[PDB]
Amino acid sequence: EPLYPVQVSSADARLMVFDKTEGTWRLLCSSRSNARVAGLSCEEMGFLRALTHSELDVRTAGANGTSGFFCVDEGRLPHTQRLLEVISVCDCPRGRFLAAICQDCGRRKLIVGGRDTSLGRWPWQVSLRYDGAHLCGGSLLSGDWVLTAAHCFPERNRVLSRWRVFAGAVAQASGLQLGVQAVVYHGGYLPFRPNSENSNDIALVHLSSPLPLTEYIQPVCLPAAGQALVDGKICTVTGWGNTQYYGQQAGVLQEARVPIISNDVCNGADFYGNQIKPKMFCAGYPEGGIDACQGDSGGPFVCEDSISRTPRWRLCGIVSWGTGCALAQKPGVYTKVSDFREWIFQAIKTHSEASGMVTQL
């Protein structure tokens, strides 16, 4: 597990960044911009936000395994997308440094050809229902925000008073069921605007009230900044979708394990013939048999790593589309979440108070 270059102490929340030139960790020198440095640092690592921050003092706190300090270029800060771009080594005379409490995520506090799952195993999984029926899955990013697919909201399914967000249970008939205040969908999603090309198949659901965080309801993390999708890696897709294309929805949330498939193979004529656009990837088996399906759309494709020095699940894909379900040489296609990190943050930063359907290019 090659560590992410930005870390946050589980003990006291100190932020630490890696020095390429020396192999050491350095603290971040406190400054007038502590708040954005905090948020930016959480964003960087793949957490949604900094809930709170504070100043620590090396006289009362210890270096705790760090050699010196980085300083943040506050002029560049508000315009950077990368923390690693705005820091330089500095003396930090006053020995005061930054700590940040991030919105925790990716951690447990306990579909075709998959298995019945248990409660708390996938606590970010939500069911998105219109008029009483399950149409789509989604993934909690906080208690009030859900990441799902744009295609879940075509013309007829745009009356928000009719959507509900079901969380906290794995059986469809069990749990908490809340309203929706807004939907921010991607304006680069050509079909919503003919019909087209499924790039930018991504939307955010803002619930009219936040869910409690429990052992059954937790957010997922996001891919950290610059984090690559690793081909062949086995990740997990879950949902209440159909267990055969021409079948019934699962009554109990299912899970299935599927490897990432390189675009080399997936774009191949044997497979998808150049239909796999660069913000999409495929996952599944050349043989077929295990796949997501109708009604898993919007739900989580999650991959577990240890790059934050503790095991974490991160939402690497969103169930977008496929030609049938579980077909040999037709794997699942997913939205590449890492490619929409700044879009997710901008949307939430901009449309937090909005109501209705909002387009964000």
Ligand X SMILES: N=C(N)c1ccc2[nH]c(-c3cccc(C4(O)CCCCC4)n3)cc2c1
Site for ligand X, rule CB under 6 A: 135-136, 151-152, 291-295, 297, 319, 321-322, 325, 332
Q: Token pair 């991030």 is at which residue?
A: 102
Containing 280, the helix (H) or strand (E) segment is strand 280-283
**Is the CB of 93 or the CB of 132 nearer to ligand X?**
132
Nearest to 283 by CA among 259, 263, 304: 259
| CA angle at 115 for the pair 111 and 116, rounded to the nearest 5° | 100
β-pairing, 180-186 vs 356-360, is: parallel
| Cis before 263 (ω within 30) | no
Shortest CB 361 distance to ligand X, Å:
22
Whole-number minimum distance, CB 323 to ligand X, in Å? 7
Contact in structure between 137 and 253 (CB atoms under 8 Å)? no
Tell me the residue length of the chain: 361
- Decide if 297 is catalytic: yes
Rounded Cα–Cα distance for residues 139 and 125 (Å): 5
- Rounded Cα–Cα distance for residues 107 and 124 (Å): 9
At its nearest, how many Å lie between ligand X and the CB of residue 62?
Answer: 50
Q: For ligand X, give the closer residue by CB, 30 or 297.
A: 297
| Residue nearest ligand X by beta-carbon distance | 322
Give the distance from CA 114 to its chain's centroid. Answer: 22
Closest distance of CB 183 from ligand X, Å: 14
Of 5 and 322, the one with the shorter C-beta distance to ligand X is 322
Cα–Cα distance between 62 and 81 in angstroms, integer? Answer: 30
* Kind plus residue range of the DSSP H or E element containing 304: strand 300-305
Does 209 qualify as catalytic in the annotation?
Answer: no
Q: Which of 31, 127, 134, 151 is catalytic?
A: 151
- Shortest distance, position 358 Cβ to ligand X, whole Å: 20
Q: Write down the catalytic residue from 142, 297, 308, 338.
A: 297
Decide if 151 is catalytic.
Answer: yes
Catalytic residue among 144, 201, 296, 305: 201
Q: Which residues are catalytic, by number?
A: 151, 201, 297
